[PDB]
C-alpha cells in the first residue's frame, strides 16, 4: 500500500525497517522483500524465472519458517536477505560478482534458517533428537535448512532455477551449501582468521575496487558476507537492534526453560533467573560482532565506517543500561 511503498524506497539501504515491511505485507516479509530485491536487481529477467513460480516458491519457503519461534522466523530470513542485498552493492565490491553469485547469496540468505525449531545445535545433540542422529552432530541445523530449501525446488510448480544451465545449477548449489554451512557459529573463529588473512593480502584496482582472482576468493567473501548479515542486528539503528534483542532473548530463555524442565544443565545466557540482557549484548558485540565487522570494514574500507560507528554507539547504549 502507500506505507509499504514508502518503506521499500529504503530497499537498497541499511536503514530499511523490516518490522514495518512485515506489518504491511500480511506478515509475509520474506516473500515481499525477496520479490522487491529480485525486481530491483532484474534477476527474474536475467535467469528467466517465472513470476508466479518465484512467488509460489517464496511463499512456501516462508510458510516453512515457524511463526511461533521468537527470533528464527521469517522476519529474520527477510532481514538477512535484505542486508545481504545491500552488502552486495558495497562500492569496494562493484562488478566483482557474476549475476549467478549474486543470485546464490541472496537465495542462501533467504533459506538459511528455514524450519528452525527455536533450539540450538547443542540442545538437539544433547536430547538425541532425530535431526542430530540424522546429521551425525555436525552442523545439524544448517544442513537441515539447506535440505528443506533445496527439497522445495523439486516440484516443477516451484523450480525457480529450471532455466539455469546444468553447469549453473551445479555451481549455484555448491555456492549456497557453502554459504549456509558457514552460518554455523562453531565455524565463526576460523572464518574470521581466514577473513583476516584475506585482508592482509588485499589487492585493489586503481578505482578502489577489490581484485578477486578465482572462485576460492569470491566464495570466501560471499560466505563472510552472509555471516555478517546474519550477525548484523547490532549494526542497525538502536530502535531495530532492541527489538531483535527482545527476540533473541525470548527464544534463548524458552530453550532455557526446556533445559530446566528436562533437568539438563542450563547454558548461562539461556537462564532467565540470572542472565543480564545488557551485559550479554555488550559481550556479544565485544567478542563476536565487533571483531567481525571491523575486519569486514578493512576489506571494504571506508564503505562500512557508518556501520562501525553505529555499532560502537549501540554498544555504549547497552553498557550505560548496565548498573
Ligand atoms: C540481538 O542479539 C543476538 C542476535 C543474534 C545472535 C546469534 O547468536 N545468532 C546466531 C545464532 Cl543464534 C545461531 N547461529 C548463527 C547466528 Cl548469527 C545472538 C544475539 O545475542 C546474543 C545471544 C544472547 C546474548 C547475546
Ligand atoms: Mg542459523
Ligand atoms: Zn540466521
Swiss-Prot record:
Output this protein's name.
3',5'-cyclic-AMP phosphodiesterase 4B
Family of this protein: Belongs to the cyclic nucleotide phosphodiesterase family. PDE4 subfamily.
User: Which residues are listed for AMP binding in this entry?
Assistant: 72, 76, 113, 230, 281, 284
Question: What is the documented function of this protein?
Answer: Hydrolyzes the second messenger cAMP, which is a key regulator of many important physiological processes. May be involved in mediating central nervous system effects of therapeutic agents ranging from antidepressants to antiasthmatic and anti-inflammatory agents.
Which species is this UniProt entry from? Homo sapiens
Q: Per UniProt, where does 3',5'-cyclic AMP bind?
A: 72, 281, 284
The residues that hold Mg(2+) are 113
| Boundaries of the shown chain within the full protein | 335 to 657 of 736
The entry marks the following residues as binding Zn(2+) 2, namely 113
Give every PDEase domain span: 1-323
Active site as annotated: 72 (proton donor)
Q: Where does Zn(2+) 1 bind?
A: 76, 112-113, 230
**Binding-site residues for Mn(2+), renumbered to this chain:** 113
Documented effect of changing residue 241 to Q:
Changes substrate selectivity from cAMP-specific to dual cAMP and cGMP binding and hydrolysis
Expressed, tissue-wise, as follows:
Expressed in brain, heart, lung and skeletal muscle. Expressed in white blood cells.
Amino acid at each position: 500500500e502507500d506505507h509499504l511503498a514508502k518503506e521499500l524506497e529504503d530497499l537498497n539501504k541499511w536503514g530499511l525497517n523490516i518490522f514495518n515491511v512485515a506489518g504491511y505485507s500480511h506478515n509475509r516479509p520474506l516473500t515481499c522483500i525477496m520479490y522487491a530485491i529480485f525486481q530491483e536487481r532484474d534477476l527474474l529477467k536475467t535467469f528467466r524465472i517465472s513470476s508466479d513460480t518465484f512467488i509460489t516458491y517464496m511463499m512456501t519457503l516462508e510458510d516453512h519458517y515457524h511463526s511461533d519461534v521468537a527470533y528464527h522466523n521469517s522476519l529474520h530470513a527477510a532481514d538477512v536477505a535484505q542486508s545481504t542485498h545491500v552488502l552486495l552493492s558495497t562500492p569496494a565490491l562493484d562488478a566483482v560478482f557474476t549475476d549467478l553469485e549474486i543470485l546464490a547469496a541472496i537465495f542462501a540468505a533467504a533459506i538459511h534458517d528455514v524450519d528452525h525449531p527455536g533450539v540450538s545445535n547443542q540442545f538437539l545433540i544433547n536430547t538425541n533428537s532425530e535431526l542430530a542422529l540424522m546429521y551425525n552432530d555436525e552442523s545439524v541445523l544448517e544442513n537441515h535448512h539447506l535440505a528443506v530449501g533445496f527439497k522445495l525446488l523439486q516440484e516443477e510448480h516451484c523450480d525457480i532455477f529450471m532455466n539455469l544451465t546444468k553447469k549453473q545449477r551445479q555451481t549455484l548449489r555448491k555456492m549456497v551449501i557453502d554459504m549456509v554451512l558457514a552460518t554455523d557459529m562453531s565455524k565463526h573463529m576460523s572464518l574470521l582468521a581466514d577473513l583476516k588473512t584475506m585482508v592482509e593480502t588485499k589487492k585493489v584496482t586503481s578505482s578502489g575496487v577489490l581484485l578477486l582472482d578465482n572462485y576460492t576468493d569470491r566464495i570466501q567473501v560471499l560466505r563472510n558476507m552472509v555471516h555478517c548479515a546474519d550477525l548484523s542486528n547490532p549494526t542497525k539503528s538502536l530502535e531495530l537492534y532492541r527489538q531483535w534483542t527482545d527476540r533473541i532473548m525470548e527464544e534463548f530463555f524458552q530453550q532455557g526453560d526446556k533445559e530446566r524442565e528436562r533437568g539438563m544443565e542450563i547454558s548461562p545466557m539461556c537462564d532467565k533467573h540470572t542472565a543480564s540482557v545488557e551485559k550479554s549484548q555488550v559481550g556479544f558485540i565485544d567478542y563476536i560482532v565487533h571483531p567481525l565487522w571491523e575486519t569486514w570494514a578493512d576489506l571494504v574500507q571506508p564503505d562500512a565506517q557508518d556501520i562501525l560507528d553505529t555499532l560502537e554507539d549501540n554498544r555504549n547504549w547497552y553498557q550505560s543500561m548496565i548498573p
